[PDB]
Amino acid sequence: SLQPPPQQLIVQNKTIDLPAVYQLNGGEEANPHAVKVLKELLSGKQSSKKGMLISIGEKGDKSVRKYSRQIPDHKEGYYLSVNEKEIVLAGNDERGTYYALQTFAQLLKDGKLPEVEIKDYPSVRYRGVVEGFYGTPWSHQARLSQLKFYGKNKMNTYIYGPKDDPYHSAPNWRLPYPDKEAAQLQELVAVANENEVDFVWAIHPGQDIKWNKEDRDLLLAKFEKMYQLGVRSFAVFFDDISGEGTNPQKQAELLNYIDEKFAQVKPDINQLVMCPTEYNKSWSNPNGNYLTTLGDKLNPSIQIMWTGDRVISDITRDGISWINERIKRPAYIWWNFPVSDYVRDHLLLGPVYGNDTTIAKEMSGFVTNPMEHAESSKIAIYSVASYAWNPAKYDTWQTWKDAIRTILPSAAEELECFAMHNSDLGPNGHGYRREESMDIQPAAERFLKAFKEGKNYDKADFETLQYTFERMKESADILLMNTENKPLIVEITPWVHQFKLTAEMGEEVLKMVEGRNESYFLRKYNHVKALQQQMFYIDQTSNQNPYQPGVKTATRVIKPLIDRTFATVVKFFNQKFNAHLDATTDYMPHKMISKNLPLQVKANRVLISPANEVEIELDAIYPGENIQINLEISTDGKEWKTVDLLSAGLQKAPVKFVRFQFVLTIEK
Ligand SMILES: CCCCNC1=N[C@@H]2[C@@H](O)[C@H](O)[C@@H](CO)O[C@@H]2S1
């Protein structure tokens, strides 16, 4: 499965052996990065004057003058041919030759090659990744791995813009990088060049920029330093800011000044990109004129980025038509998937879909904003690379499977199982959701409806659920020990542990359904409760970021199935035996009475779940920080003390009981 799929392909039912003796034509004049890849593939074979001909070079070179009319006349295009007599690897330009060898490398299976003719080129000019998220920036080693991945998948753009890099954003965008960071960026630029990737260094000055000479000069001086480090593409971001920095005329004047005094003055600057303040249709104000001002004033060679109809959205024909008409040029898409920085307790490992496949001519570029988990993001990155190169032939599911098999060939089926059930975002303020667990959701829905109603569930549905949990356990345990992509496994391990616990819980709940005698049922009930406690422990000790701490997995279909099945069968047990087993589905060490709203623990906070439509007792005495609501305290539940106020400080007073958003913060 060639990825990305080439524009034009003709295969014959004949196989050629990678010649033991070959004659290289054009190795001295072709793209060195391409030649280097080719010599690596021919490492065990000898190069004599006889033997199979191998012609590599760019259009205009002597080596490929024969095939000049076969080479597509598109940037980054190439012509590739293999037959029993000769191999041709001919780019329309140097990057095309490199892309011919990236395809050539996929065709080489077991030392054999298919007899094939290929004419290929990208439908979208700029394709790649923007490290543009909030959270821990990708490590240096992660970024190096990313750049080699991009070259392999014909992504030619990497836009560096981590929101939390202090030399990228306010206020220290004015300061040059220290020497250590600068040397790293220098290495990144070189590795990008060797993999045929434009390294675009972005700056995010909007929150405190002054529209004066001083800050203009500092931004240009910063761009000059980055240029001395090797950077040849630049971006200015005005996203997620307030104040004077949002002025579209001033933004356009600044970008045009950079364009005329820097971008066009250097000999060798490629991309110049900006992000507007109103960067999706819903944030555009029809009472004003922001987008048409940038469209008219900004020099036309400058790119303008866009996320679609909403902050998080997929690109439609009507949507891109809407923006293009206003910015007077094809939008450069910033696609906010798989970025998870607003649902940080979820991994987003599902397929890439939703974007119209017929609108390649309507966009200048297409980049994905990924997760702070770099390796995990390669599933979506690989798929975007395929979509962007050949959208007409974009195959969502086959590309997702191909990505997984490329990233983790030693355990591809196990990663597919995990990713299949780790793709929805859960409820969130952007309203963006993805499908998850589609394969088993019909059997889960049938089983639960029947069980709740007292009707016989279908045996096949019960067995599908049993199979699912068994496979999840297998997949979790195999993934934990996989050593082929250790950085990937480091990233996902907390979710893999939670995933296994979910599967164990689901198995034990199904045995309660199979429930044969009272003592067996009780053992399973006690086991389930302990597993709930273990999932709480992981949720409280892993991924403790300040915004969405913890680890959630299989949230769309499976955890609701298990929670609801457990609650139902415990109700049935209590009815049958006149018992009073607790049917709560998530462990909570603290207690609340009055509401069935569950309490939640997040970091050092104890909170009542908000709802759409009271006494808290903690498991110990803690020093109190504050209580926030949108009021009495005690340590023994007998002697109380009132607190005035919504908000109220506790001043480290001992707290075990509270009585009256509803959140208590305590010291730890
Ligand atoms: C139009 C291109 C700029 C879009 N910029 C965005 N900035 C924020 C990003 O840093 C976040 O990662 C993204 C997802 O939360 O939301 C918005 S989208």
Residue numbers in the entry: 4 to 597, 603 to 621, 631 to 647, 659 to 673, 680 to 694, 708 to 715
Per the authors:
The enzyme responsible for removing O-GlcNAc from proteins is O-GlcNAcase (OGA),23 which is a member of glycoside hydrolase family 84 (GH84) of the CAZy classification system. Inhibitors of O-GlcNAc hydrolase (OGA), the enzyme that removes O-GlcNAc from proteins, lead to increased O-GlcNAc levels in cells and are seeing widespread adoption in the field as a research tool used in cells and in vivo. Structural data of inhibitors in complex with an hOGA homologue reveals the basis for variation in binding among these compounds.
A butyl chain, however, leads to a greater than 100-fold loss of potency (15e, Ki = 350 nM). To assess the structural basis for this stepped decrease in potency observed on going to the 2′-aminobutylthiazoline 15e, we determined the structure of Bacteroides thetaiotaomicron, a bacterial homolog (BtGH84) of hOGA, in complex with the parent 2′-aminothiazoline 11a, the tighter binding 2′-aminopropylenethiazoline 11b, and the butyl derivative 15e, which shows greatly diminished binding. In all three structures, the respective inhibitor binds in the active site in a conserved mode with an invariant hydrogen bond pattern for the aminothiazoline moiety. Even a small further extension of the alkyl chain, as in the butyl derivative 15e, leads to steric clashes with multiple residues in the cavity, driving the side chain of C278 to adopt a different orientation. Furthermore, we observe the polypeptide main chain surrounding C278 is shifted away from the inhibitor. Thus, the size of the pocket disfavors substituents longer than three carbon units in chain length, and those inhibitors having such larger groups induce unfavorable conformational changes within the active site. We also noted that the selectivity ratio for hOGA increases as the 2′-aminoalkyl chain length increases to the three-carbon propyl (15d) and propylene (11b) derivatives, but this trend reverses once the chain length increases further, as seen for the 2′-aminobutyl analogue (15e). This suggests that once the 2′-substituent passes the volume that can be accommodated in the active site of hOGA, increases in bulk are even slightly more deleterious for hOGA as compared to hHexB.
